[PDB]
Design a protein around this ligand. Sequence first.
Ligand SMILES: *[C@@H]1O[C@H](CO)[C@@H](O[C@@H]2O[C@H](CO)[C@@H](O[C@@H]3O[C@H](CO)[C@@H](O)[C@H](O)[C@@H]3O)[C@H](O)[C@H]2NC(C)=O)[C@H](O)[C@H]1NC(C)=O
Ligand SMILES: *[C@@H]1O[C@H](CO)[C@@H](O[C@@H]2O[C@H](CO)[C@@H](O[C@@H]3O[C@H](CO)[C@@H](O)[C@H](O)[C@@H]3O)[C@H](O)[C@H]2NC(C)=O)[C@H](O)[C@H]1NC(C)=O
Ligand SMILES: *[C@@H]1O[C@H](CO)[C@@H](O[C@@H]2O[C@H](CO)[C@@H](O[C@@H]3O[C@H](CO)[C@@H](O)[C@H](O)[C@@H]3O)[C@H](O)[C@H]2NC(C)=O)[C@H](O)[C@H]1NC(C)=O
Ligand SMILES: *[C@@H]1O[C@H](CO)[C@@H](O[C@@H]2O[C@H](CO)[C@@H](O)[C@H](O)[C@H]2NC(C)=O)[C@H](O)[C@H]1NC(C)=O
Ligand SMILES: *[C@@H]1O[C@H](CO)[C@@H](O[C@@H]2O[C@H](CO)[C@@H](O)[C@H](O)[C@H]2NC(C)=O)[C@H](O)[C@H]1NC(C)=O
Ligand SMILES: *[C@@H]1O[C@H](CO)[C@@H](O[C@@H]2O[C@H](CO)[C@@H](O)[C@H](O)[C@H]2NC(C)=O)[C@H](O)[C@H]1NC(C)=O
Ligand SMILES: *[C@@H]1O[C@H](CO)[C@@H](O[C@@H]2O[C@H](CO)[C@@H](O)[C@H](O)[C@H]2NC(C)=O)[C@H](O)[C@H]1NC(C)=O
Ligand SMILES: *[C@@H]1O[C@H](CO)[C@@H](O)[C@H](O)[C@H]1NC(C)=O
Ligand SMILES: *[C@@H]1O[C@H](CO)[C@@H](O)[C@H](O)[C@H]1NC(C)=O
Ligand SMILES: *[C@@H]1O[C@H](CO)[C@@H](O)[C@H](O)[C@H]1NC(C)=O
Lengths: 595, 585, 591
Amino acid sequence: TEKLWVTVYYGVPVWKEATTTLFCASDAKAYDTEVHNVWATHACVPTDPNPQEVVLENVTEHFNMWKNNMVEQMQEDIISLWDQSLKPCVKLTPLCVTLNCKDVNARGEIKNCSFNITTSIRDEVQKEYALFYKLDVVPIDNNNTSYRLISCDTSVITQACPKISFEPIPIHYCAPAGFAILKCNDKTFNGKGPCKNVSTVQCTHGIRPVVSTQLLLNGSLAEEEVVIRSDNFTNNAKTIIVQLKESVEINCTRPNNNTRKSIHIGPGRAFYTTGEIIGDIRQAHCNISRAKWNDTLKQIVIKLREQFENKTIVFNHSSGGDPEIVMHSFNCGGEFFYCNSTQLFNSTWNNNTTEGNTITLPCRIKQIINMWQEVGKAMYAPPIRGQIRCSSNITGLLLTRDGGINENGTEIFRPGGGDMRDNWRSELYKYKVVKIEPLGVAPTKAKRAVFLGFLGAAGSTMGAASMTLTVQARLLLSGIVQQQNNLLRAIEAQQRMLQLTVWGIKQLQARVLAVERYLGDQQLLGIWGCSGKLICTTAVPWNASWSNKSLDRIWNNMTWMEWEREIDNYTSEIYTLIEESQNQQEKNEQELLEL
Amino acid sequence: TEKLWVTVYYGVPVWKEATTTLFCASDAKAYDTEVHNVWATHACVPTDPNPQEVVLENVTEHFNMWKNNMVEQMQEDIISLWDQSLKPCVKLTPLCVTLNCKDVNAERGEIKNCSFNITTSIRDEVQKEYALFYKLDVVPIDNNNTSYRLISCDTSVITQACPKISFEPIPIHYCAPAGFAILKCNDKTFNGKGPCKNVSTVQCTHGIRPVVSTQLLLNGSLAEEEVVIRSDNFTNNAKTIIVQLKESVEINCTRPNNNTRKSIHIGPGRAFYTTGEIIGDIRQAHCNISRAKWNDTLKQIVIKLREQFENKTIVFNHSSGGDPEIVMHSFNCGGEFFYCNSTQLFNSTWNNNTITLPCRIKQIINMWQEVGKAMYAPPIRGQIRCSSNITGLLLTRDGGINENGTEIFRPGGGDMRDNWRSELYKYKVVKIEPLGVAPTKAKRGFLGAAGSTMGAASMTLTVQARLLLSGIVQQQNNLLRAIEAQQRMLQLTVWGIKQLQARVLAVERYLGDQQLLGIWGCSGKLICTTAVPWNASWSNKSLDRIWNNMTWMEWEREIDNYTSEIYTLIEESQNQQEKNEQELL
Amino acid sequence: EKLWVTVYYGVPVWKEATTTLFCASDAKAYDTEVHNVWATHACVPTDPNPQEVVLENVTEHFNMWKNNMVEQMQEDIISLWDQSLKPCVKLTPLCVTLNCKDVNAERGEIKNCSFNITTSIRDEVQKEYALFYKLDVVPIDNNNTSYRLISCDTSVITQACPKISFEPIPIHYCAPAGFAILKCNDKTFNGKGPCKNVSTVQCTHGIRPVVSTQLLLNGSLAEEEVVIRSDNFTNNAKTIIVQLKESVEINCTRPNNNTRKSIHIGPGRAFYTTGEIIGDIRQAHCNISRAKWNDTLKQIVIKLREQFENKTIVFNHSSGGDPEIVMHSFNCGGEFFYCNSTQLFNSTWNNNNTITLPCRIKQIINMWQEVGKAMYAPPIRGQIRCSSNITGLLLTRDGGINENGTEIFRPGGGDMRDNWRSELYKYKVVKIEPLGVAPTKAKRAVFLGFLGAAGSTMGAASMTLTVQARLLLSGIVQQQNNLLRAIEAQQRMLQLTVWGIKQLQARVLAVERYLGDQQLLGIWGCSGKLICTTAVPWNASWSNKSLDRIWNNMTWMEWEREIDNYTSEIYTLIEESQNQQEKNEQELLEL
Ligand SMILES: *[C@@H]1O[C@H](CO)[C@@H](O[C@@H]2O[C@H](CO)[C@@H](O[C@@H]3O[C@H](CO)[C@@H](O)[C@H](O)[C@@H]3O)[C@H](O)[C@H]2NC(C)=O)[C@H](O)[C@H]1NC(C)=O
Ligand SMILES: *[C@@H]1O[C@H](CO)[C@@H](O[C@@H]2O[C@H](CO)[C@@H](O[C@@H]3O[C@H](CO)[C@@H](O)[C@H](O)[C@@H]3O)[C@H](O)[C@H]2NC(C)=O)[C@H](O)[C@H]1NC(C)=O
Ligand SMILES: *[C@@H]1O[C@H](CO)[C@@H](O[C@@H]2O[C@H](CO)[C@@H](O[C@@H]3O[C@H](CO)[C@@H](O)[C@H](O)[C@@H]3O)[C@H](O)[C@H]2NC(C)=O)[C@H](O)[C@H]1NC(C)=O
Ligand SMILES: *[C@@H]1O[C@H](CO)[C@@H](O[C@@H]2O[C@H](CO)[C@@H](O)[C@H](O)[C@H]2NC(C)=O)[C@H](O)[C@H]1NC(C)=O
Ligand SMILES: *[C@@H]1O[C@H](CO)[C@@H](O[C@@H]2O[C@H](CO)[C@@H](O)[C@H](O)[C@H]2NC(C)=O)[C@H](O)[C@H]1NC(C)=O
Ligand SMILES: *[C@@H]1O[C@H](CO)[C@@H](O[C@@H]2O[C@H](CO)[C@@H](O)[C@H](O)[C@H]2NC(C)=O)[C@H](O)[C@H]1NC(C)=O
Ligand SMILES: *[C@@H]1O[C@H](CO)[C@@H](O[C@@H]2O[C@H](CO)[C@@H](O)[C@H](O)[C@H]2NC(C)=O)[C@H](O)[C@H]1NC(C)=O
Ligand SMILES: *[C@@H]1O[C@H](CO)[C@@H](O)[C@H](O)[C@H]1NC(C)=O
Ligand SMILES: *[C@@H]1O[C@H](CO)[C@@H](O)[C@H](O)[C@H]1NC(C)=O
Ligand SMILES: *[C@@H]1O[C@H](CO)[C@@H](O)[C@H](O)[C@H]1NC(C)=O
């Protein structure tokens, strides 16, 4: 009552949005390993499966799609994970020399090359027999036969180590302690904004690291019907994403059986190019029936008619520039296929207001692959002693708006390509992470049979949120190491090269940042003069300068998220005045305990 | 009362496995201002203060000590040490060079003068030098081409050894962090997977010197009095067979070769030490050893071998051909690479006087496993005169057809992981779980780990639990010079890194224990008693047998192996009640 | 009686120890996008308002030649320059001979030089004109057309990293926990002996990296009586350090409008040099105010003849030796400066306007320490001015025997270490650890005034003043810059930087002290308050101290330090006897 002796609270189920370093999870990568060269590309600790997942149904929150910081780290992580890969790999340094080449017909784009190379200490190789594609050389000296080397002006002599494999792994992702990822269990709800049905998630689903253009290889389904996600404010001038309800696999073909042919170059230097092919090569294709795709295009216009009153729907092909963006990068088999999709949008959509049931697409894989965000450091891959038929279900799409005005109601959808980020935004569009301040403080009250939610206490009955505070901490910050409890030193602590990892050093950074909160909290608990108690009734009465509500209403329906920001005017204010009076207690009995 | 009233027993002596990298320790008299120059370890920077241990014998358990987790750390660790020293070393540019070799004054297969042709690094002068090199470490083609190519130049790079650093194996006491026990067994005769009556826990190992083996165990510790194999191996003939040894054997092996050094510059900061001229004699490295003792050992061997083979007829045959280094014995004293042809040592047959061994040396060493890493031997002047202790062997069931006496051993050189497995079979690393609650029927300095009911022996391990981070007690790491030796040179990040990684594990394990202390409102006092009823759904047994007939180990094994929810269930019983005494007081 | 022991946790125990150095940036006033590796692109911002407490009653010797923190910090800048050069490129193909011409006249100073090369892999040859000095080119074959770089024949050579600069940011060296920094506010303190007027500060003041040789600029002015420092005045082979209360500015600038040429080496390498010249060039001359330079030399021989009277001191130059030593090395904003000190020491000064400095510029910079590596300096476009105050000098004493008895002095220099010794005369960091016991005959305000308070008193205020010290032990935002938790969210960066290594260094050891403190709180005293932690057993037969409470009324904590030589084991004997009570209180609760 009016005694108003304000009382601290430890472990209050509250949260603040914060951005801190992530954490990974690899039960499945720890479940099997043929060779650790993918683990060299993708190293992570297991996570003890069947994790706990809890629903918080009574509190909506504003989800901010397109603008979460969790996008930013995971993209810059993987580039660094691409950096560790290329550190031991050799640099193809003398290679921007001239080329004499003659074209080979089986098509018409495959060309062998032999030239006066000085590759080793000795052995001037001139019978060099090196087969290349049209797309992997720059045509120079067109009357002569020079015709070579796309990007050797810049630092592109990096190449792939042949023993290293590239097959992506579904990787779950967790958080360091004191942080919890929020998962909206509403269904495909918007492209930006809040949602009611939500939940906490400790560790997300698995994500294969996959990058493709205008196209969603091995993606994630939509349990609803087809949905769209946009920003819808600069909608006229911004590429947005498309999510598909069902999926279609596409089996994509084999050129022919192939040969590796190590060429003597130097110290660790022996790369590969094809000198032999078993038989006569067939044109690479990705095989699919039109009719299922014919079904999908109608489903698009349904979403288009939801946005547009009655606009015409047109599909031209995108412009000539950015050829990797124009085509479709299929990186399956560790091999970077590109396929012409001009056989896809011959049809523009008829406003309604089997001739070719199936379709295969013309394809050319490239042998040299460039870093996209800057100029320099292209990645070279060696050929395979084989021919690969990969297949992947396709679950989404990326398209441009193509903004303008031409015939007043007719707008075109040329296809839309992007960066690696927007590939990775899409699956993460149901996940946001917050931090935990377990401490709270509210004035006193009158008088001095289930598992519960982590945030359902803040979800509903914030007055009756007075219980279960401890177990809300025992998974989230407490148990500093909740990932593989006992802190399993495992196939990450086992068999790690150099002991200088992106993960473990950050993991070293992780657990230290865990405790200095908790200890520094408990420092502050000692500064508050009490530890080991959830509450501590303290010796200032609540001055009503801060608020004017009644006692019962606060223990009625007042959300913690409400109640924290009402008292955010007096954050350090309500801190300092009681601890100094607690320090005034400290100057009372200390002089008394001298005698 | 008859109800289960549970109450915390902190510090109950229970162990359970955990894989964890651990501490090391070395003598303070060993370093001699050359922590780096002795070997890559910086002579194991944390000191070895005291061996003060106790031995802990109540009962035996089969800790199946054959399969072992410690080794995999250590064999990873050693490779981390060898690239560590070799990283500031410099590469070799003249890799695949012709180098027409000639020998001085005809013994054959030796060092060849190879007339080193080179143009230097960035300058433009075709020079000629004196390349004095073995037949072994180099390869020509076609017997008319003097294309003496380097044996690994097509494979990978090669680098000089930074020759200030020597190659001495240091007796190192591999210790452990907090909450960790190193199991050992003073009972004799246990072969890998075994139990052990005379059993004990230590905090540090003895001063192990892990160095080099092809098939023989060198400078290793002795066995029991009976020369008996103490490993577990399946009866498949492809399973490798180690054996220990009682009688230490000592062999004189030396160089009749008094070479000089020569430095050859190529590039900036790149002068290359090579073999100079040899003073005086040029004879082959050999190994004097008494075969009568080898006769005396071999008789003592086969009797135990006939005992484990139901009186089979064992005949030793010389091993098959193959790799140069698996077959011929790369044994390395003085940091040089003796290869010894053991064709004198298995012309031997069984049914019911100073042998001298001709040897030879190659320079260039690869990893057997990762094909990208090669190491070059620096020339050292003088003549190497050193020996060894010999206390173990490794062979294999060969596997011929049964028209023989049904046992042939043709020896085999193997993987390195074997060589740490060779001694740690009597070792095991376990983790300690001072947590524990038993139902206690009440409505709210001898030895560390033994007994069935702890009168106060749990408190003894709390003293070990308060060896956590005292900063002053010499037993843990003393954290006084150990706290200062790391902070000076932590930039090395090879050896002190795991130490500070051990600090990481040291705190948060303890801190989570410090949490779960304060989580249940226990706040020390070792008891933390609660008036919470618990049903006999878990146990309808006499409480008295639970006290004394059984310990708390097997009681934890029996019913507690699953009741991990009781932690949460005693949490909420606290959590509700603490709110109740908050709400009522 | 008296129980002969009580625990008394918080007691100020100053104690010499060497821990890892800690520091923070003050780029908060700068916020430069340019990294400037010394600036660390703002490691961590500093405290605006620290507090400083002077302890008057303490005297203590502080050797200013046995500091660890100098060479540690000297090691740091060496390691700092490692993370500078290791990103950018080395001049590996550029180590070849070259034919060179003089542009005009001066008189052979500036050298336009030419060479056939293919820094490209695309297999061409052409002559590459480039503009140089006489100062960096070795002549070959009777000084004919053959020329090379002086360096690169031994060391390895890199290009300096173009996007950053070479400006020192004053920074506050500091301490996380336990240990702290000391200052002595008295004067004429050569670095030996004790001193009074002693303070302690948590951090340091803003300290800029001093790098120049034979010259001391932008540093400690210390405006009291002119003092001089050296190690051992018996030995002539000791460095003689000058402090001056006055600050002579010296303006020095580029006498040349110049441009940049960027020679494309190859893929992302792209060497930078000077493009051209606008007009003619001079030798970057400088002004000293010779009359003040007349004045300064009058001031210094006073204290010199105060130390050694009737010694007719004459100035001499150094012999022809090492160019780092014999010349004034100098940096200000980029390039390097080498001015002749010959025009100083024609003066003698035995008994009683403007100036010119011909100056030189070395492009290549070899390894100061031993041999290993070398650095190339690319030029900067346009003219650059620099005027800077001079605070001090380094000198030496010759050793040849005079029958005139003259003390001949010549320029002393050639150690990057002593630039750090130049500032750290006042500064010492000792461990402070809160533990200390006392047999007390009990019934059985100044802020951070630790040693001003006495072990004689050990007063009730001395108790609460260590309560202030355990207020220092806990860290949150703005009590602690590492536990400034706003920067902790900002610190998403990699910690592979040496400074980031210092972060993960200093934080955990601060914790495990505070843990190891908190580990020993309960097991020793079983109390939160430091006094009521008491022990019964009468250490008389083995503490063995012929004293009393009335002796303790006039004592000190160094007595307790002398007690530690005798009783260090007795704490463990106390602690097992401390264990004796709760093992008998256990059987009260056991049965
Ligand atoms: C997709 O839509 C775009 C425009 O909405 C079409 O681009 C148009 O292509 C035609 C054919 O080349 C262009 O016609 C020519 O234009 C030039 C320059 O204006 C003119 O001099 C010629 O006489 C001829 O008319 C037209 O300009 C161009 N429009 C734009 C805006 O670029 C494209 O053809 C459509 N895709 C398909 C498959 O039809
Ligand atoms: C400053 O320091 C220099 C270097 O120590 C002193 O140079 C020395 O000057 C004397 C006086 O001329 C030289 O003596 C000469 O010796 C030759 C050969 O015996 C003789 O032919 C001359 O007549 C004269 O006696 C001495 O060689 C020279 N030494 C060096 C190393 O330069 C100089 O005297 C000092 N001056 C002052 C004012 O301190
Ligand atoms: C530092 O002080 C010196 C003086 O000791 C300054 O040098 C003086 O600079 C002026 C202007 O640059 C010179 O005057 C010029 O003389 C030439 C030749 O007669 C004339 O053609 C010009 O129009 C101008 O009148 C003066 O001769 C020169 N004297 C000396 C002794 O150096 C110097 O500029 C000062 N530097 C700074 C940064 O303050
Ligand atoms: C590419 O061209 C090269 C050279 O024109 C071909 O290499 C020749 O192969 C035949 C047998 O396969 C040899 O007899 C010749 O000696 C080779 N040439 C040289 C210069 O040695 C190569 O077969 C051609 N490959 C393709 C796929 O077109
Ligand atoms: C709200 O999210 C919850 C999960 O947080 C969803 O709960 C699932 O609901 C279905 C249908 O009742 C059950 O099959 C599942 O077992 C429920 N999961 C759990 C955790 O209980 C619910 O479907 C969501 N609602 C919306 C509209 O998507
Ligand atoms: C006494 O023990 C039994 C057996 O463990 C408990 O039965 C469990 O009760 C929960 C609900 O509280 C059920 O969800 C479980 O399925 C039951 N277990 C089994 C094996 O059927 C019983 O609850 C315990 N009694 C009390 C009062 O806690
Ligand atoms: C050296 O040059 C500096 C740079 O101009 C001179 O400093 C100037 O001094 C005058 C007179 O005191 C002032 O009016 C200017 O404001 C100062 N400007 C700057 C930028 O400092 C300095 O006086 C010169 N000294 C000598 C000895 O030449
Ligand atoms: C609980 O809060 C809601 C939200 O304002 C309100 O509508 C409702 O009336 C409250 N309950 C009572 C009993 O007033
Ligand atoms: C057979 O083994 C027994 C011991 O089991 C031994 O007494 C006897 O000597 C053995 N015979 C052979 C031939 O070794
Ligand atoms: C020393 O301490 C005394 C008090 O004991 C004080 O009066 C005196 O001023 C102090 N002297 C200084 C400043 O060191």
